[PDB]
Amino acid sequence: VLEKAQLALAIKSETTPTDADVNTLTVGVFGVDGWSVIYTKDATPNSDGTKDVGPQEVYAGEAHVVVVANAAPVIQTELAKAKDITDFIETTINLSDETLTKGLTMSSKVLDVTLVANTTNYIGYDDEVGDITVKDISGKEVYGAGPVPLVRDVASIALAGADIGNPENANYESKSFVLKEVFIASAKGVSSVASTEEWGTIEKDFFGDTHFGYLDYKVGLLFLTSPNNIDEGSYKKGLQTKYDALAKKHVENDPALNHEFYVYENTKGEVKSGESNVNEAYANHTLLIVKGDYTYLPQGAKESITKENCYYAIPVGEEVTIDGTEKRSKFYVQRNYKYEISLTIIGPGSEIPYDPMISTNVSASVKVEPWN
Ligand SMILES: [Cl-]
C-alpha cells in the first residue's frame, strides 16, 4: 500500500511569442520504490514572474522529479509512458518542433525530494524547506531553493557580421562582399529531453549502435547530386534532411544578419564508419555557411572582378570567446548558449558549399554568451 499526496510546483521564468515562453509543463515524479506519476498541464502565470503547475495527486515517499517545458504533444505522451527517470530524460525530442509558437523545449535537473503523505507538497514556493501556506492551502515546501530553474534544450546560432579584409600574401585587395544567404548544415535534429545535472549534456550520439544517422542531421538547403554530386563534400557527409528554418535569404528589409537559428547539441559531429574524404574539423560538426558576391582588385589590374555566389563555411565553436575574454577550443554546440559569428572575408569563396577552392578565404570570430 502507498499513501496519497498532492504536489504543486513553481518554475523560474524570464503577446508576440518569445524564446523564454513557458506554455506547458510536463512533470515526471518517480518514487524510489518504483511508482511513477507523470502529467502535463498549462503553466499558470504568477505575479512574481514564476509559473506554476496546479496541485496534482501523487504518492508519498522519496522521489525523483524532473520538469519539461513546452513538450510537443506526441512527446508529452512518450514522457507519460516512462517507467523510470532514465527513460523519461532520454526521451528523444525533434528539432522541427522547436518554434516560438510551441515554445522552446526546456528542462530542469533531476530533483530529489521526500513527499509527505496526506498533504500538499510544494516545490519551488519558498527558499527553505518547511511548512508554508499558499492561497490558504497549507502544506510543506519539500525542495526549498526557490522556483525551479529550466534550461533550454536548444542553442541559438547567428551571423553577427560579415565584412572584408586583406591577406598578408597580398596578390590582391578585397573590395566588397554582398551577403545573399546564410544557412546551417549538420544540425543534430534529435536530442534527449533532459539531463540529470543542471545544464548537463543532452546530446544524442549518432551511428555506432544508436539508430541515428545522416537523415537525423538537418540542413537548410539541398544541392544537386548529379552529375557532380555537390550535396556532400569534405565538409559535410551524407544525405541530410532539409529543414527550411535552417536557411535564410538576406534582403534589406528582412536580413539574414542577426537572424537566430535553433539547433540541438552537437559536439561529436559523427560520420558513418568507412566514409572517404572526411575533413574531421568540418564533417559533421554543425556549420554556418554564408553565400555572397565577393569583389577584389587583382595586383595591377585596371579594374576589379566580382565572383558571384561564393560560399564560406565555418565549423561552429571550433574556437570560441567565452565569458567576455576567455577562450575555448572544441566547444562546438552546447545547449542554452547564443553563438554570435563574425566573419572576415579575405578572398574568393568556393563555388560549392561543402568543399573549399584553394583556400577557405574566411576568418571567423565566435562569441558565446549564456542565453538570456
Ligand atoms: Cl528566407
PDB file of C-alpha atoms and ligand atoms in Angstrom, residues 180-182 244 247-251 254-256 259, ligand 1:
ATOM      1  CA  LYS A 180      22.939  36.731 -50.209  1.00  0.00           C
ATOM      2  CA  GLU A 181      22.206  33.731 -47.946  1.00  0.00           C
ATOM      3  CA  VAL A 182      23.036  32.159 -44.590  1.00  0.00           C
ATOM      4  CA  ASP A 244      13.623  25.287 -44.228  1.00  0.00           C
ATOM      5  CA  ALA A 247      18.239  28.759 -44.248  1.00  0.00           C
ATOM      6  CA  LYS A 248      17.715  32.499 -44.565  1.00  0.00           C
ATOM      7  CA  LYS A 249      17.939  34.739 -47.592  1.00  0.00           C
ATOM      8  CA  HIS A 250      19.444  38.226 -46.929  1.00  0.00           C
ATOM      9  CA  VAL A 251      17.263  41.115 -48.176  1.00  0.00           C
ATOM     10  CA  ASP A 254      14.368  41.040 -43.902  1.00  0.00           C
ATOM     11  CA  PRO A 255      18.065  40.437 -43.175  1.00  0.00           C
ATOM     12  CA  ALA A 256      19.984  37.207 -42.652  1.00  0.00           C
ATOM     13  CA  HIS A 259      18.778  36.013 -37.633  1.00  0.00           C
TER      14      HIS A 259
HETATM   15 CL    CL B   1      14.246  33.367 -46.397  1.00  0.00          CL
END
